[PDB]
Design a protein around this ligand. Sequence first.
Ligand code: BCL
Ligand code: BCL
Ligand SMILES: CC[C@H]1c2cc3[nH]c4c(c3C)C(=O)[C@H](C(=O)OC)c4c3nc(cc4[nH]c(cc(n2)[C@@H]1C)c(C(C)=O)c4C)[C@@H](C)[C@@H]3CCC(=O)OC/C=C(\C)CCC[C@H](C)CCC[C@H](C)CCCC(C)C
Ligand SMILES: CC[C@H]1c2cc3[nH]c4c(c3C)C(=O)[C@H](C(=O)OC)c4c3nc(cc4[nH]c(cc(n2)[C@@H]1C)c(C(C)=O)c4C)[C@@H](C)[C@@H]3CCC(=O)OC/C=C(\C)CCC[C@H](C)CCC[C@H](C)CCCC(C)C
Ligand SMILES: COC1=C(OC)C(=O)C(C/C=C(/C)CC/C=C(\C)CC/C=C(/C)CC/C=C(\C)CC/C=C(/C)CC/C=C(\C)CC/C=C(\C)CC/C=C(\C)CC/C=C(\C)CCC=C(C)C)=C(C)C1=O
Ligand SMILES: COC(C)(C)C(=O)/C=C/C(C)=C/C=C/C(C)=C/C=C/C(C)=C/C=C/C=C(C)/C=C/C=C(\C)CC/C=C(\C)CCC=C(C)C
Ligand SMILES: COC(C)(C)C(=O)/C=C/C(C)=C/C=C/C(C)=C/C=C/C(C)=C/C=C/C=C(C)/C=C/C=C(\C)CC/C=C(\C)CCC=C(C)C
Ligand SMILES: COC(C)(C)C(=O)/C=C/C(C)=C/C=C/C(C)=C/C=C/C(C)=C/C=C/C=C(C)/C=C/C=C(\C)CC/C=C(\C)CCC=C(C)C
Ligand SMILES: COC(C)(C)C(=O)/C=C/C(C)=C/C=C/C(C)=C/C=C/C(C)=C/C=C/C=C(C)/C=C/C=C(\C)CC/C=C(\C)CCC=C(C)C
Ligand SMILES: COC(C)(C)C(=O)/C=C/C(C)=C/C=C/C(C)=C/C=C/C(C)=C/C=C\C=C(C)\C=C\C=C(/C)CC/C=C(\C)CCC=C(C)C
Ligand SMILES: CCCCCCCCCCCCO[C@@H]1O[C@H](CO)[C@@H](O[C@H]2O[C@H](CO)[C@@H](O)[C@H](O)[C@H]2O)[C@H](O)[C@H]1O
Ligand SMILES: [Fe+3]
Lengths: 274, 41, 43, 44, 43, 52, 52, 51, 51, 51, 51, 52, 44, 102, 325, 52
Amino acid sequence: ALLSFERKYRVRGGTLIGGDLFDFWVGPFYVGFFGVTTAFFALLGTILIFWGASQQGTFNPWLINIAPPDLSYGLGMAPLMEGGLWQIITICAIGAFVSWALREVEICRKLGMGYHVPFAFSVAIFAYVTLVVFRPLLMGAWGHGFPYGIWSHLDWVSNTGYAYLHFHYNPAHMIAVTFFFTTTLALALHGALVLSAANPPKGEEVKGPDNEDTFFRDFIGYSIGTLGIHRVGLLLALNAGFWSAVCIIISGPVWTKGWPEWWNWWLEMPIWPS
Amino acid sequence: FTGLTDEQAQELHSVYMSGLWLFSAVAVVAHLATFIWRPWF
Amino acid sequence: LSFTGLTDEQAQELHSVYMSGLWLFSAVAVVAHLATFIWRPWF
Amino acid sequence: DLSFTGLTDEQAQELHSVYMSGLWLFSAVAVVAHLATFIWRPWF
Amino acid sequence: LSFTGLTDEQAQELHSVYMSGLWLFSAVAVVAHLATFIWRPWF
Amino acid sequence: MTCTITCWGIGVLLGIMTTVGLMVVGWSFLQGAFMGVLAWLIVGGVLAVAVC
Amino acid sequence: MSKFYKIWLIFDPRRVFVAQGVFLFLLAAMIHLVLLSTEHFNWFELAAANAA
Amino acid sequence: SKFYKIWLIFDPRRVFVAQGVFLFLLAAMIHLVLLSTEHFNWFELAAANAA
Amino acid sequence: SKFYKIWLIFDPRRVFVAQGVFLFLLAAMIHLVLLSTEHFNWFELAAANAA
Amino acid sequence: SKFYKIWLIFDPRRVFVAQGVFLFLLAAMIHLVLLSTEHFNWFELAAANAA
Amino acid sequence: SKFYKIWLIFDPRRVFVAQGVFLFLLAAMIHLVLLSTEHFNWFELAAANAA
Amino acid sequence: MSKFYKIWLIFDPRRVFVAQGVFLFLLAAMIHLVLLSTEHFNWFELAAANAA
Amino acid sequence: WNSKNPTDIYKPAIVVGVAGGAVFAAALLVSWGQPLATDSMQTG
Amino acid sequence: SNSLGRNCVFCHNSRAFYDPAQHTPQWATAMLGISMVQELNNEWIVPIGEAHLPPERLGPVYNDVPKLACKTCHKGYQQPLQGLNVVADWPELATTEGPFYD
Amino acid sequence: PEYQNIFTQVQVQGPAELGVDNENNLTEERTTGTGFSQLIGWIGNAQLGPIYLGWFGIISLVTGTLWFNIVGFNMLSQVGYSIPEFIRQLFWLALEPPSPEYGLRMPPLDDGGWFIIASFFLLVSVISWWLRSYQLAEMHKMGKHVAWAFAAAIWLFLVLGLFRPILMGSWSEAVPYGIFPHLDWTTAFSIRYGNLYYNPFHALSIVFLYGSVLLFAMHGATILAVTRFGGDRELEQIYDRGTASERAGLFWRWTMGFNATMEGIHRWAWWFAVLTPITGGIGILLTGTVVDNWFLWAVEHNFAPDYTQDYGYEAYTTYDGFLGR
Amino acid sequence: VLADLTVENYDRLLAAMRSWTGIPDLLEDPDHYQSKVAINMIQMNQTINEEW
Ligand code: BCL
Ligand code: BCL
Ligand SMILES: CC[C@H]1c2cc3[nH]c4c(c3C)C(=O)[C@H](C(=O)OC)c4c3nc(cc4[nH]c(cc(n2)[C@@H]1C)c(C(C)=O)c4C)[C@@H](C)[C@@H]3CCC(=O)OC/C=C(\C)CCC[C@H](C)CCC[C@H](C)CCCC(C)C
Ligand SMILES: CC[C@H]1c2cc3[nH]c4c(c3C)C(=O)[C@H](C(=O)OC)c4c3nc(cc4[nH]c(cc(n2)[C@@H]1C)c(C(C)=O)c4C)[C@@H](C)[C@@H]3CCC(=O)OC/C=C(\C)CCC[C@H](C)CCC[C@H](C)CCCC(C)C
Ligand SMILES: COC1=C(OC)C(=O)C(C/C=C(/C)CC/C=C(\C)CC/C=C(/C)CC/C=C(\C)CC/C=C(/C)CC/C=C(\C)CC/C=C(\C)CC/C=C(\C)CC/C=C(\C)CCC=C(C)C)=C(C)C1=O
Ligand SMILES: COC(C)(C)C(=O)/C=C/C(C)=C/C=C/C(C)=C/C=C/C(C)=C/C=C/C=C(C)/C=C/C=C(\C)CC/C=C(\C)CCC=C(C)C
Ligand SMILES: COC(C)(C)C(=O)/C=C/C(C)=C/C=C/C(C)=C/C=C/C(C)=C/C=C/C=C(C)/C=C/C=C(\C)CC/C=C(\C)CCC=C(C)C
Ligand SMILES: COC(C)(C)C(=O)/C=C/C(C)=C/C=C/C(C)=C/C=C/C(C)=C/C=C/C=C(C)/C=C/C=C(\C)CC/C=C(\C)CCC=C(C)C
Ligand SMILES: COC(C)(C)C(=O)/C=C/C(C)=C/C=C/C(C)=C/C=C/C(C)=C/C=C/C=C(C)/C=C/C=C(\C)CC/C=C(\C)CCC=C(C)C
Ligand SMILES: COC(C)(C)C(=O)/C=C/C(C)=C/C=C/C(C)=C/C=C/C(C)=C/C=C\C=C(C)\C=C\C=C(/C)CC/C=C(\C)CCC=C(C)C
Ligand SMILES: CCCCCCCCCCCCO[C@@H]1O[C@H](CO)[C@@H](O[C@H]2O[C@H](CO)[C@@H](O)[C@H](O)[C@H]2O)[C@H](O)[C@H]1O
Ligand SMILES: [Fe+3]
């Protein structure tokens, strides 16, 4: 159905490659040319996952595991039951994600709003892209991508993390994590600020931007403002996604050795009186 | 102030051509001199 | 005509000083380059 | 005439004169120092 | 002429005592280096 | 901006120069980079404050 | 040759000059460094071989 | 001969700053790559020449 | 002989703060590098002298 | 001979600070280069000359 | 033929810049591809024939 | 069919010409690179074989 | 004769420049091929 | 890992560092190495070090004999000398008695 | 291209804004000195506001510095007061928790005794800061959402160093005060107790931690997308919604089939952020105390994947082949 | 430990051990601690090859 104000905004136009052919809504969702490709790619990828689960022998969501081929197969296509299905689902996943981002461009173009959201999603796509197609090419084997399982891809992170000898000392992982913690810290404080101002104790007037602006001025001595928090917060999250891409793209094809041994430059400098 | 005009076009190209010929004249001498020192053909 | 708000009457004067500095910079550069030929040739 | 800093030619006459004097004084100390270290340990 | 709101009357005075401080700072540095050179020479 | 951006550009050029300057006399790329990054923060901030 | 001044009506003289100014230096520097990369046209090592 | 018209389209203060930084970086880079080579290294030559 | 008018363009309080920081940092840096070498490390020379 | 007109293009305060820190950084860099080499490093030379 | 009508639809002032950069990348790209192959390293070929 | 001229009543000539112009180029780029990718259809590598 | 119409001269040049750059980069990665090449040993 | 020039997943699965069913065959070899290093240090290296090694070869803190470990024989490689057959030419060092040149 | 509202293209500065104030009379404990910074103004407010010098804040600052100093001087005493070595090993030195053979009993100063003293002062500073947040919201007549959101972070903070060690039977279970050492503790904690990947509450906390970053990229971009409609003024859009709230809602209604309000977005934003340490605090609290091996817990609960391939490199390649010989 | 070795093998082993350990005069003087350790090291080396 439609919201109480949705009727006016539902106007034709604002499409990239599609026209009025795909310019319609299915329920609340907006279908476009890229919503057509999203539906095809997502359904094909989802079905192939369950087809692989059927051949794997288990339908348990925890135990479903579609894995990339062996490293011996290199960059070529593998047999479907030997890793080839993972490659196709990856191709479907890339198409589904890119089309979803391109559909969001059509959503915001129709609404006259900015393209910040599809750009922000593209950073998260780049983090997935660098994990499944960029890192394997730099290594010359599709088998370095994470398997498509709820817990199997946790084993890949564990094994890849220890494949570089205490991944915690990875400088880009160190930068990426502190962006993840800061974004959650910023999300908690920002969400608290608006809710606290809008929801005072019973019998008290609602607080405007000035009251919430001065709260952190009295709390931490500086308030970034109503507008500032959203742009700094977007950059905090995008940096978290970007530096996550860096920490895994520099793991294998850049620093094959252990990550603590990377810090040998700091420990071994001419300035230090050995 | 945006845009050019025909009157300034003849002089701008002429001085640009003079610079290009001067740059090329040094370049051919540099290329010729390097050939005796060490030919690449 | 002028495109940076600088008149053509003194535009020639600006280039006259600039070229004199450029030649002076190249004069010592050539002398320095001449000296390093004698010290250690590379041709 | 032309002036991007709002400084007249007469002022630039004094400003460059002291700067040139500072240029020579800084160079003269460097020249003496360069000759002194060359005697100690020549490099060419 | 002026960029910091000072005139020749007091800017000359300011440099007069600044050089006095510079000479005093250098004078105690000269004897300090002379004492160190006698103790542990570096030439 | 303008002056501040240019002053930052001078620092990153100086940081790159110090990165390769220390590599020539030894050190390593990572050791030189830290000095280059440190130089960019110091002289870049000083120039952006004093010059501008 | 001299009749091709009509093209200049399209370009902003400042934009094209700075674009071509950095282009020539980058191209010249790139050509110089690939000459340094090869073992035959690297004039620095040629002097070393000549001077033994 | 008409090279003086270059200042009609370039800001003298903008180009001079760019010219100043470019020349020093070019001079430093040429000096630096010279030190990288063993043959054209006056610091290493003096040590070898002395002993 | 006419260097007194440097302050006509330089603010005293703006350059005195920078100069004071620079002089101490330079003095500490020279002291630190002097302690790096074993020949001028007066703390180790005192230990070796009394040994 | 007419180089005095550069100050009509460059702001004195902005350019004096720029070359004021350029000289010190250049002087420190050149000095630090001499530390890196072995022939012109006066600290090891003093130690070597002291047997 | 009758190819002169291509400018009745395409903008001549907009295509030269697109064309001009397009031929630049081809010349730059093909020149580097030749250097990758040992049979067309004219820099390295000048050494083999002069050896 | 001789009545194919009506495609221009549906497609904008300016928009389709730039559409194929890029498309025709990626054709040339993609297929040529696929040839270079294969060892058999790499004329650059083949010339080396005939040289020896 | 001169035509005076509003155009965006650099709009298509940058479009083909990045598109050419992708073709440019691919040619380098095919001719030379994987500068800092690495190999992995599957242990599981 | 540093002594072997390899990583953690060279010997066992990261998700189960304890499970013998999730161990590379190289893990079993490392068990023999741990026993061998303990045997070599406690009975071969230390007893002969405390008897003849001069003080200049002793430790800086405890003045103890140097001990061998994984990197002493591997030197940062998966196998010593990258699996170069070194004892085939030297039957004398292969057995304690009767070199068995054959 | 269209102006993306990432950096303000022009910023104005007027008289410094002190505060709103009420009969709670916050002015006496509020600083009278403020500063302005244009560098930070390109992305946020350019005014460095005045601290409110409350007693909870002062106690937290004083005792927090005491914990910081105590850890610092023990670190300085680690390398024997060698500053160059202290700077070099700054990321490696720490104040290690007491040895496990002491239990809850007070250990000697060199073996974790100073850790307990530093931990006690850190506990006071952290709690006092929370009381400052609660009091500041109370004095401003605002909601206590900041205090409750902070209290969630205290939960994992208390579980990591106070709650779990008390009911684990030893103070050795606390986290060392070091840059790399608490990373070593983080890895060793997962290794000792199986694999925290297979801890469901660790997985749940990861779900909300990714969701927290996901939402605040969604919320940050969506507000910046509707900032052309005054979407940055969220509070006024809550009381009287304009086209900014409607377009932001319809963007996500047309994308993922459902949306939020300008106020309901922060309830979603608040809870995933708050749930991240709450779920993590539960998982750590019952790690070792209840479950001593998480992978084995996964095996018996049938959510640990099974692999049918061989585990040796010899099964996929050979040593000579890997080396290329 | 080396008496039973043949003359050709003993010379072959002694020359290798001196080159393998970097001691040119290994086992020249039995009183030297080099010889004392080397004899035990020979027994250790045989132990590793057969017992491990
Ligand atoms: C032993 C393991 C090592 C370790 C090894 C690794 C490895 C290995 C990796 C990380 C990576 C990451 N690590 Mg680590 N890391 C360790 C310890 C930690 C700790 C901690 C407290 O201890 C933390 C916080 C982190 C944090 C992180 C983040 C920096 C990052 C997570 C991925 C991410 O950013 O998103 C990136 C992923 C995406 C954004 C996914 C994109 C999603 C797509 C676009 C949309 C999905 C749609 C999908 C179809 C769902 C739709 C279905 C329904 C319809 C909705 N690591 C341990 C020590 N870490 C991972 C990384 O960086 O990845 C880039 C990585 O590969
Ligand atoms: C090999 C490493 C282990 C690992 C071991 C652990 C351990 C151990 C823990 C986590 C926990 C976390 N892990 Mg894990 N984790 C691993 C792999 C990962 C990966 C990944 C991609 O691989 C990710 C994304 C995560 C993600 C996470 C987060 C979900 C969670 C912590 C949330 C948090 O910030 O709480 C917020 C709370 C805090 C960080 C402390 C609050 C700080 C206090 C309130 C502030 C005091 C300030 C202080 C005084 C300093 C003030 C100074 C100021 C400058 C003035 N882990 C692997 C399995 N993980 C935590 C958990 O379990 O949660 C259930 C935890 O304890
Ligand atoms: C990338 C930067 C950060 C970020 C941002 C971000 N994500 C976003 C957006 C933004 C700004 C959106 O606008 C978009 C959205 O609409 O969200 C509701 C989205 C989105 N990111 C999502 C999830 C997500 N984000 C994550 C993280 C992050 N979000 C980053 C920290 C994570 C992590 C790391 O845990 C996940 C899982 C979705 C909710 C949504 C993307 C929706 C989408 O792509 O829909 C089309 C596709 C389908 C409906 C199904 C496709 C199925 C495939 C064809 C087959 C399976 C492929 C897959 C790889 C298998 C996985 C197997 C196992 C590993 C589980
Ligand atoms: C909902 C979960 C998220 C969260 C939320 C959260 N954190 C919060 C809050 C909230 C809602 C606050 O209100 C509170 C705050 O005020 O934030 C600005 C806070 C906070 N969480 C913080 C950190 C933090 N949050 C983290 C994470 C998280 N907290 C989660 C992601 C992390 C992690 C896990 O990495 C950290 C490290 C702080 C910024 C702050 C708590 C600070 C506080 O109020 O008291 C702590 C102690 C002090 C202020 C005293 C410190 C001592 C000195 C200031 C340092 C030394 C100074 C100097 C060197 C002295 C030198 C002296 C000598 C020269 C003598
Ligand atoms: C202040 O401002 C703001 C708001 O408030 C104005 C907001 O609200 C939000 C939004 C944020 C919120 C918190 C609101 C509430 C939302 C959430 C809690 C979710 C976000 C948080 C997460 C942790 C992510 C969780 C993920 C979820 C809930 C899943 C959503 C994503 C999906 C990909 C699933 C939905 C997509 C589907 C089903 C497919 C899309 C459909 C199409 C493309 C249609 C295609 C159709 C055809 C081609 C025709 C064929 C038709 C068929 C087959 C018929 C079938 C019909 C169907 C309907 C399937 C933000 C950021 C904001 O800042
Ligand atoms: C890998 O690369 C390897 C192989 C290493 C390599 O070698 C690469 C080298 C390559 C590519 C060479 C590239 C070098 C080039 C291109 C040379 C440019 C250099 C030039 C052009 C010299 C300018 C000199 C300018 C001065 C110095 C002017 C003097 C100015 C004076 C002092 C003051 C002027 C001031 C005024 C006029 C204003 C006052 C007047 C008025 C106000 C009226
Ligand atoms: C790898 O590299 C290796 C090989 C290591 C390397 O070494 C590379 C070396 C390279 C590249 C050399 C680069 C150096 C160059 C190019 C030298 C420039 C240096 C110059 C030019 C010296 C300026 C001196 C300025 C002074 C000192 C002025 C003194 C000013 C005085 C104080 C006067 C001030 C007075 C007033 C203002 C009053 C007037 C005011 C009014 C009237 C108002
Ligand atoms: C890395 O390389 C190695 C080899 C290690 C290295 O060491 C490199 C060394 C290098 C590069 C040396 C760099 C040092 C240089 C360049 C030396 C600058 C130092 C100078 C110049 C010293 C000024 C001292 C002046 C004072 C301190 C005056 C005191 C002033 C007094 C306090 C009076 C102030 C009061 C007034 C003025 C009142 C006026 C007021 C009214 C009139 C109202
Ligand atoms: C190994 O393989 C490699 C080699 C890698 C390879 O295969 C790639 C090779 C590749 C890609 C070669 C492609 C080369 C090309 C395309 C050649 C570019 C070169 C060009 C185009 C020459 C421009 C010359 C411009 C000047 C020099 C003008 C002089 C300007 C003067 C000095 C200015 C005078 C002043 C004015 C005009 C004032 C104007 C103002 C008013 C009138 C007010
Ligand atoms: C110039 O500087 C000088 C001056 C030198 C200086 O100082 C510099 C200081 C320097 C460098 C120190 C820098 C500190 C660093 C890097 C440490 C990072 C710290 C980290 C990562 C913290 C992780 C663990 C945190 C938890 C998780 C705590 C748990 C706390 C618990 C909750 C406390 C519970 C309470 C008790 C156990 C007490 C019980 C007893 C009673 C109640 C009586
Ligand atoms: C952050 C962004 C990261 C961007 C990532 C870009 C990844 C680029 C991958 C480059 C590797 C592919 O380029 C590689 O080129 C080599 C060099 O001849 C070619 O061939 C090479 O790989 C193939 C595998 O297919 C081998 O069988 C072959 O023996 C080897 O020579 C292939 O064409 C391709 O494998
Ligand atoms: Fe918000």
